[PDB]
Amino acid sequence: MSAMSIYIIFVSIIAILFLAIDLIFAPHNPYKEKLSAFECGFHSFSQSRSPFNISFFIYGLVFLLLDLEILLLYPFAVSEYVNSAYGLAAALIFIGIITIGFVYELGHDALKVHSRQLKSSVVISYLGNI
Amino acid sequence: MIMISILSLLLSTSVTLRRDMSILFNRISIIALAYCILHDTMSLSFISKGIGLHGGLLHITNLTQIFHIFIFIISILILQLTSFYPRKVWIPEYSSLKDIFFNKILYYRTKIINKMGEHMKIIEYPLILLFVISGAVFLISTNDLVSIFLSIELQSYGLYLLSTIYRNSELSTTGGLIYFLLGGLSSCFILLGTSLLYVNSGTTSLDGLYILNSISDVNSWYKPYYLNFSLLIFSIGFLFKVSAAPFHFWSPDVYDAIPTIVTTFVAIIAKISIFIFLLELVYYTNSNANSYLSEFSWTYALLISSLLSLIIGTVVGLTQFRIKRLLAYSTISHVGFILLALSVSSIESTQAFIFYLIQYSISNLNAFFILITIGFSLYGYVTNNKEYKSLLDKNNSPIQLISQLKGYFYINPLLSLSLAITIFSFVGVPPLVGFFAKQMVLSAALDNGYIFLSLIAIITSVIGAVYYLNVIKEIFFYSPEHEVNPVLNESDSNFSLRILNEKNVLIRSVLLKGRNIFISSPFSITISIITNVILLFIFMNKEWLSMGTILVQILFSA
Amino acid sequence: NITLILFLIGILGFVLNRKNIILMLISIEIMLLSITFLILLSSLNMDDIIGQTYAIYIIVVAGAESAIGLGILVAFYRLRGSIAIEYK
Amino acid sequence: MVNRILFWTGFGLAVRFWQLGIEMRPFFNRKSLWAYPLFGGVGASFGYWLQSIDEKQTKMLEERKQAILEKRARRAQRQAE
Amino acid sequence: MASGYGLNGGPSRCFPFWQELLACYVTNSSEDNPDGKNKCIPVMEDYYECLHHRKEAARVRALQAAYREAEAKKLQENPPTAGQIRNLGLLNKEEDTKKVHCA
Amino acid sequence: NTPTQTYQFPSKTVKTDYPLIDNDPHFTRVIRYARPSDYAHGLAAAAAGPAALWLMERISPSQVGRGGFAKAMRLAGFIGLAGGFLYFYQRSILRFYGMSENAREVEMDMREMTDRVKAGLPLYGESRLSPAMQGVAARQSRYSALFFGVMPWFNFVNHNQHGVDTAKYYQQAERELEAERLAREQA
């Protein structure tokens, strides 16, 4: 049988053997305060299962599509001798269009998380007395 | 050209966040679509059923090119709404050629022209529209199964983004969301349709499947049952997108939910491109000899849909009080006539199908323009109706109700007559162009033995004429619920306009009131031309009808 | 045969789903997967590299669809506040 | 009587009329009178263009009608064999 | 399949059958004779046979049942073991090969 | 030096008014065979787009900020230049496609090519690309200026698959080779 198939088995049995030892030879004494959430020693509101703002999700959307783009460039890398010049041109036409949409994401500041925590424009003039 | 125009417009759009640029990015897109027209006009000097392009993936036909040019004109006309301000100030003191070309008029126009309106502040709007046109035109030219799927997606995804581009509207986000979800269901049917074709036939070429289909037309191990019912699943996915019944439910809601300048382009372009694509499929898959394959033709869905689209479109439109829900049901009854002409495949019915699709697309566009203009005219008018106060997103759909049009013939008579002529043309009354379209499809169906569908259609039309007449009854028969604004016409508040010459020197200062505020010319001229085309079609029918006579002769010859 | 079974799961998980719109958008991802699988399995039987090419282009547009979906879903949620689909 | 050129000249005049009616602006304002030769002139320019495409459409159907008869005439010739 | 491009970078195994069907149609079908394409029917079945294999699946089913029922009924003398089969055509195993071939 | 075969590849036949010279002409030939009218029309077409956006600005201002119109001119300037070059290329290549009056182009095609024959040099020239890659290039660009409104494409590949029987060029040059030898005899 093949080296890969046994390799998968052995890594899984190791993940089991280590786990089984701890499941058997360690003390197990579960109580209410031992089984509470860690919050630096004070119990707080349980609110990790409610909607939470993600300030970088626009990254996740663009990450989705640029992965499809670099995967579509991997057959070219392993076919260059046959693609040659004529095939190179299409690969460059494809990467130029993909790159324009990337310049769109840099230009609009779509990959920018805003965070921190503008000068006087009132000039007075003196005419003196009436 | 359309691809260079998208890339060039995208590079300029990507280095600006200035919302004041939206009007000029729309004006450049109209210039771009005019070059596309000049290019597809040059490509028209050949007679051919089809010429394979780009490694067989794409094709060009005289029918393919006449349709891209039509899409380009329609797009130029819809693009005008975001290219010019709705209102205007006009005085006789500024009305000569020397005045327009060598004088300037200074005045406070921010409120009068709605400079900062939502339709004038979306930078990417023309760009997403160009992508939908790019997808539409590529689909008419698709010759492969894989090309079809990518092109319908490029068309569909842009229509989802256009339906959602008003991101601060809960009504557009909802319409956008429904459309994306149910259209994604529609595309999964289209992908299954193509996938079963390649799996049973070993080929992605439409040209190869048509050859297998023509051999199999004779008069034992591999009967080609797959072609008719792979094409059936493929067809249902396109009946969703043209909103033919019984796959129509989304379109009344989406069209009513999204803004009206947007619903103009989204309710017109998908139909032209999808119907032209189906036409070539229906011609090249028809078994001239009666056969076991004929008994199972995928085109019977089109007859079932046309049947259903006639009943559903006219009946459900009877009790619609919302003008956008009414316009969408009117479309579902017109796509029934289109489907009936597409399912009878004959020279006369192909002429009828081609004529009907172009005329309905110009007529439905007139209906949208009049509607949009009527709700920009109400700027110097005031109402006290609780219903007109309880509406939602009144900025994105100024006119939402049929009753909002009550007495419009007493506010602006010619715009009300323009809408009357357009509506009467939807009914099918002579001597308007819509009558001739309906008659051509009835003549073809009667000739080919579809006597029963002809009888459905005529009875259906009288039912649909009921709700068309309730619209006109609203315009003409009662009094306006809208009143001139009392302060815009008060003889005490007037803005100052000032006329300068070619080099920043004052000529004459003027004081102007609300009666000096009119619709901008690009919309009144556009409504004027389409109204008169509809009105006077009988004196100008020769070149338009012959254009469809010749295209059908090329498609059915050799 | 797994092609039909997977396609039926995604069709009902789209039409019979009464939970939320991300699960709507997931079930489309399942249907496309089953169709790609049918195309990939046929292409190996017919010695065709075109079917694998067709598969790869259904993966790229299936990701484009899911990005456009998640973008539209966020827009809708910002205004509605729930992407839960409501029955009764 | 319908001259392709006179109609489209008349057509352009009526667009300007219908424009001003929809806009609710006075017809036949004196400083704007130039728009009637202009709308009318453009309509004639279109009519000249239509006239040309009409000449090209007569030929194509004239060729086609000949091509149909010839296709039909030689078809029955082989039947008599 | 119909494309001409197979899995190893070489040509698709059903491409010759597709090119013959296209060649037959173009060279028999015409406007003068609508019925030349009836010559393309056997050529069309063969392209489907190289694609799905239903007819070659049907032949092997018939012969395989006929074959097994004959060998089962047939008199049996001595089975050539797997090791003997593995020793066919070797350098110094002449005895094993002769037993396998019964020569 | 007759190849004995002048139609190696199957090509699409189109019903056109004028004679077909080349369904996939090289970019240099389209430029070289362009008439002075083609420069005139393409230059006017390039001027048409920014001149259109200027007139729209004069008659109906956009009320844009201080530097927005100059930005829009640069885009309109490019798009008209891009649109007018496609117009100029399309006008010359149609005379090669047999889809425009091309009497001048036919004779300068018969001279150029029959010169290449008697010179022994390849009619369409030599290519770095492999013979199969040439085919893919010919099948991607032949008749491809008919799609210029949607997707532009130009032939930069020297391939031998141009849709025309090449016998007329050989059949011609030898007659110019027959007369040249006879004229040299009487000297």
mmCIF file of C-alpha atoms in Angstrom, chain F:
data_model
loop_
_atom_site.group_PDB
_atom_site.id
_atom_site.type_symbol
_atom_site.label_atom_id
_atom_site.label_comp_id
_atom_site.label_asym_id
_atom_site.label_seq_id
_atom_site.Cartn_x
_atom_site.Cartn_y
_atom_site.Cartn_z
ATOM 1 C CA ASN F 1 8.712 26.701 -57.568
ATOM 2 C CA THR F 2 4.990 25.977 -57.689
ATOM 3 C CA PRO F 3 3.760 24.620 -54.319
ATOM 4 C CA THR F 4 1.385 22.287 -56.267
ATOM 5 C CA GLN F 5 -1.235 23.053 -53.528
ATOM 6 C CA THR F 6 -2.637 26.618 -52.986
ATOM 7 C CA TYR F 7 -5.606 26.003 -50.594
ATOM 8 C CA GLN F 8 -4.066 24.053 -47.654
ATOM 9 C CA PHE F 9 -6.703 25.040 -45.061
ATOM 10 C CA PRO F 10 -10.586 25.121 -45.108
ATOM 11 C CA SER F 11 -11.801 28.739 -45.001
ATOM 12 C CA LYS F 12 -15.183 30.473 -44.617
ATOM 13 C CA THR F 13 -16.686 31.821 -47.878
ATOM 14 C CA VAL F 14 -18.747 35.032 -47.464
ATOM 15 C CA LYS F 15 -21.126 36.597 -50.033
ATOM 16 C CA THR F 16 -19.506 40.039 -50.601
ATOM 17 C CA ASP F 17 -19.656 42.577 -53.504
ATOM 18 C CA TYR F 18 -15.886 42.924 -54.129
ATOM 19 C CA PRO F 19 -13.020 40.418 -54.610
ATOM 20 C CA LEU F 20 -11.428 38.837 -51.507
ATOM 21 C CA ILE F 21 -7.691 39.669 -51.141
ATOM 22 C CA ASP F 22 -6.979 38.585 -47.542
ATOM 23 C CA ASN F 23 -9.347 37.546 -44.692
ATOM 24 C CA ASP F 24 -6.507 37.972 -42.131
ATOM 25 C CA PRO F 25 -4.213 40.788 -43.366
ATOM 26 C CA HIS F 26 -1.127 41.719 -41.306
ATOM 27 C CA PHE F 27 -1.415 45.048 -39.360
ATOM 28 C CA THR F 28 1.280 46.571 -41.536
ATOM 29 C CA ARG F 29 -0.666 45.859 -44.744
ATOM 30 C CA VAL F 30 -3.857 47.417 -43.359
ATOM 31 C CA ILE F 31 -1.894 50.588 -42.572
ATOM 32 C CA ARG F 32 0.101 50.499 -45.812
ATOM 33 C CA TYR F 33 -2.953 49.948 -48.012
ATOM 34 C CA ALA F 34 -4.984 52.629 -46.241
ATOM 35 C CA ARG F 35 -6.145 55.416 -48.531
ATOM 36 C CA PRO F 36 -5.675 59.099 -47.664
ATOM 37 C CA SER F 37 -9.435 59.183 -47.118
ATOM 38 C CA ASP F 38 -8.956 56.682 -44.295
ATOM 39 C CA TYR F 39 -6.641 59.073 -42.469
ATOM 40 C CA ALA F 40 -9.108 61.903 -43.055
ATOM 41 C CA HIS F 41 -12.175 60.020 -41.748
ATOM 42 C CA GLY F 42 -10.381 58.480 -38.719
ATOM 43 C CA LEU F 43 -8.941 61.859 -37.687
ATOM 44 C CA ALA F 44 -12.439 63.485 -37.941
ATOM 45 C CA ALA F 45 -13.944 60.566 -35.939
ATOM 46 C CA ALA F 46 -11.297 61.001 -33.186
ATOM 47 C CA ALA F 47 -12.110 64.756 -33.072
ATOM 48 C CA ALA F 48 -15.874 63.969 -32.906
ATOM 49 C CA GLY F 49 -15.941 62.640 -29.309
ATOM 50 C CA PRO F 50 -14.226 65.485 -27.327
ATOM 51 C CA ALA F 51 -15.889 67.955 -29.683
ATOM 52 C CA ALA F 52 -19.181 66.355 -28.675
ATOM 53 C CA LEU F 53 -18.419 66.667 -24.953
ATOM 54 C CA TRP F 54 -17.370 70.317 -25.564
ATOM 55 C CA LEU F 55 -20.684 71.225 -27.272
ATOM 56 C CA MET F 56 -22.650 69.437 -24.485
ATOM 57 C CA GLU F 57 -20.651 71.544 -21.991
ATOM 58 C CA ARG F 58 -21.307 74.782 -23.902
ATOM 59 C CA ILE F 59 -25.073 74.268 -24.452
ATOM 60 C CA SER F 60 -25.806 72.436 -21.146
ATOM 61 C CA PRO F 61 -23.064 72.810 -18.428
ATOM 62 C CA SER F 62 -22.381 69.967 -15.937
ATOM 63 C CA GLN F 63 -21.772 72.508 -13.075
ATOM 64 C CA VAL F 64 -18.626 70.426 -12.278
ATOM 65 C CA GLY F 65 -15.886 71.662 -9.885
ATOM 66 C CA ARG F 66 -12.708 73.511 -10.912
ATOM 67 C CA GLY F 67 -10.746 70.690 -12.523
ATOM 68 C CA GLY F 68 -13.288 68.060 -13.472
ATOM 69 C CA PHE F 69 -13.950 69.034 -17.075
ATOM 70 C CA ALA F 70 -10.269 68.886 -18.017
ATOM 71 C CA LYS F 71 -10.272 65.388 -16.531
ATOM 72 C CA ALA F 72 -13.308 64.442 -18.636
ATOM 73 C CA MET F 73 -11.662 65.834 -21.774
ATOM 74 C CA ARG F 74 -8.693 63.514 -21.271
ATOM 75 C CA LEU F 75 -11.012 60.506 -21.172
ATOM 76 C CA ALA F 76 -13.109 61.768 -24.088
ATOM 77 C CA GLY F 77 -9.911 62.584 -25.946
ATOM 78 C CA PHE F 78 -8.618 59.041 -25.541
ATOM 79 C CA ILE F 79 -11.918 57.308 -26.363
ATOM 80 C CA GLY F 80 -12.257 59.307 -29.555
ATOM 81 C CA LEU F 81 -8.677 58.542 -30.532
ATOM 82 C CA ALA F 82 -9.277 54.863 -29.760
ATOM 83 C CA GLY F 83 -12.614 54.912 -31.568
ATOM 84 C CA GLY F 84 -11.203 56.795 -34.522
ATOM 85 C CA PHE F 85 -8.238 54.453 -34.965
ATOM 86 C CA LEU F 86 -10.573 51.453 -35.012
ATOM 87 C CA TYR F 87 -12.613 53.356 -37.619
ATOM 88 C CA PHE F 88 -9.534 53.987 -39.801
ATOM 89 C CA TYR F 89 -8.301 50.340 -39.504
ATOM 90 C CA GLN F 90 -11.819 49.008 -40.271
ATOM 91 C CA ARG F 91 -12.048 51.152 -43.498
ATOM 92 C CA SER F 92 -8.791 49.729 -45.001
ATOM 93 C CA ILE F 93 -9.342 46.053 -43.906
ATOM 94 C CA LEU F 94 -12.854 45.968 -45.494
ATOM 95 C CA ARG F 95 -11.094 46.608 -48.889
ATOM 96 C CA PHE F 96 -9.034 43.487 -47.965
ATOM 97 C CA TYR F 97 -12.200 41.630 -46.865
ATOM 98 C CA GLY F 98 -13.877 42.258 -50.211
ATOM 99 C CA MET F 99 -16.597 44.189 -48.373
ATOM 100 C CA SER F 100 -15.700 47.616 -49.867
ATOM 101 C CA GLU F 101 -14.680 48.870 -53.396
ATOM 102 C CA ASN F 102 -11.049 47.754 -53.566
ATOM 103 C CA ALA F 103 -9.800 48.096 -57.150
ATOM 104 C CA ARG F 104 -6.654 49.909 -56.019
ATOM 105 C CA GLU F 105 -5.962 47.337 -53.296
ATOM 106 C CA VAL F 106 -6.288 44.345 -55.640
ATOM 107 C CA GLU F 107 -3.651 45.597 -58.080
ATOM 108 C CA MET F 108 -1.205 46.608 -55.362
ATOM 109 C CA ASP F 109 -1.840 43.176 -53.824
ATOM 110 C CA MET F 110 -1.100 41.435 -57.113
ATOM 111 C CA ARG F 111 2.105 43.421 -57.526
ATOM 112 C CA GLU F 112 3.478 43.101 -53.984
ATOM 113 C CA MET F 113 2.782 39.365 -53.837
ATOM 114 C CA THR F 114 4.041 38.439 -57.301
ATOM 115 C CA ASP F 115 7.166 40.407 -56.413
ATOM 116 C CA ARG F 116 7.511 38.143 -53.368
ATOM 117 C CA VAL F 117 7.153 35.068 -55.590
ATOM 118 C CA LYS F 118 9.938 35.993 -58.004
ATOM 119 C CA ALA F 119 12.019 36.947 -54.960
ATOM 120 C CA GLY F 120 11.422 33.454 -53.566
ATOM 121 C CA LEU F 121 10.428 34.927 -50.205
ATOM 122 C CA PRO F 122 7.275 33.659 -48.392
ATOM 123 C CA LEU F 123 4.081 35.455 -49.559
ATOM 124 C CA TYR F 124 2.969 36.261 -45.989
ATOM 125 C CA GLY F 125 6.521 36.154 -44.526
ATOM 126 C CA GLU F 126 8.217 34.099 -41.806
ATOM 127 C CA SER F 127 6.927 33.379 -38.252
ATOM 128 C CA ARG F 128 8.690 32.682 -34.939
ATOM 129 C CA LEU F 129 5.473 30.852 -33.893
ATOM 130 C CA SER F 130 4.950 27.098 -34.496
ATOM 131 C CA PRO F 131 2.797 25.971 -37.504
ATOM 132 C CA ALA F 132 -0.133 25.011 -35.156
ATOM 133 C CA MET F 133 0.184 28.292 -33.198
ATOM 134 C CA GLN F 134 -0.110 30.086 -36.578
ATOM 135 C CA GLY F 135 -3.396 28.245 -37.181
ATOM 136 C CA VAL F 136 -4.797 29.338 -33.802
ATOM 137 C CA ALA F 137 -3.748 32.930 -34.675
ATOM 138 C CA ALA F 138 -5.400 32.765 -38.161
ATOM 139 C CA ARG F 139 -8.605 31.263 -36.648
ATOM 140 C CA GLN F 140 -8.719 33.976 -33.948
ATOM 141 C CA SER F 141 -8.278 36.961 -36.267
ATOM 142 C CA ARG F 142 -9.728 36.162 -39.708
ATOM 143 C CA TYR F 143 -12.651 38.521 -40.445
ATOM 144 C CA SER F 144 -12.111 39.879 -36.930
ATOM 145 C CA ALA F 145 -12.540 43.577 -37.728
ATOM 146 C CA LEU F 146 -16.294 42.882 -38.090
ATOM 147 C CA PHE F 147 -16.406 42.630 -34.252
ATOM 148 C CA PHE F 148 -14.428 45.909 -33.633
ATOM 149 C CA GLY F 149 -17.521 47.496 -31.987
ATOM 150 C CA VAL F 150 -17.256 44.926 -29.191
ATOM 151 C CA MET F 151 -13.768 43.386 -29.008
ATOM 152 C CA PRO F 152 -10.777 44.758 -30.938
ATOM 153 C CA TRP F 153 -8.179 42.477 -32.457
ATOM 154 C CA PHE F 154 -5.249 42.940 -34.856
ATOM 155 C CA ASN F 155 -3.104 40.336 -36.699
ATOM 156 C CA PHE F 156 0.596 40.647 -35.752
ATOM 157 C CA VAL F 157 1.381 37.019 -36.811
ATOM 158 C CA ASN F 158 2.942 36.180 -40.211
ATOM 159 C CA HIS F 159 0.978 33.018 -41.084
ATOM 160 C CA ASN F 160 0.146 31.417 -44.460
ATOM 161 C CA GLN F 161 -3.576 30.810 -43.874
ATOM 162 C CA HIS F 162 -5.306 33.851 -45.486
ATOM 163 C CA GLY F 163 -8.368 32.301 -47.243
ATOM 164 C CA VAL F 164 -7.255 32.880 -50.884
ATOM 165 C CA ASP F 165 -5.942 30.461 -53.548
ATOM 166 C CA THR F 166 -2.319 31.598 -54.035
ATOM 167 C CA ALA F 167 -2.085 30.047 -57.537
ATOM 168 C CA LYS F 168 -2.948 33.355 -59.262
ATOM 169 C CA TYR F 169 0.241 34.956 -57.788
ATOM 170 C CA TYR F 170 2.459 32.060 -58.971
ATOM 171 C CA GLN F 171 0.515 31.729 -62.194
ATOM 172 C CA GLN F 172 1.243 35.431 -62.656
ATOM 173 C CA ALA F 173 4.918 35.809 -61.702
ATOM 174 C CA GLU F 174 6.109 33.121 -64.119
ATOM 175 C CA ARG F 175 4.541 35.156 -66.916
ATOM 176 C CA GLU F 176 6.586 38.112 -65.699
ATOM 177 C CA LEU F 177 9.455 35.609 -65.572
ATOM 178 C CA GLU F 178 8.636 34.425 -69.092
ATOM 179 C CA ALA F 179 8.576 37.949 -70.529
ATOM 180 C CA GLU F 180 11.706 39.026 -68.636
ATOM 181 C CA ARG F 181 13.796 36.227 -70.155
ATOM 182 C CA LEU F 182 12.474 36.876 -73.670
ATOM 183 C CA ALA F 183 13.172 40.604 -73.341
ATOM 184 C CA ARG F 184 16.725 39.758 -72.262
ATOM 185 C CA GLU F 185 17.192 37.519 -75.312
ATOM 186 C CA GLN F 186 16.765 40.414 -77.757
ATOM 187 C CA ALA F 187 19.685 42.345 -76.253
#
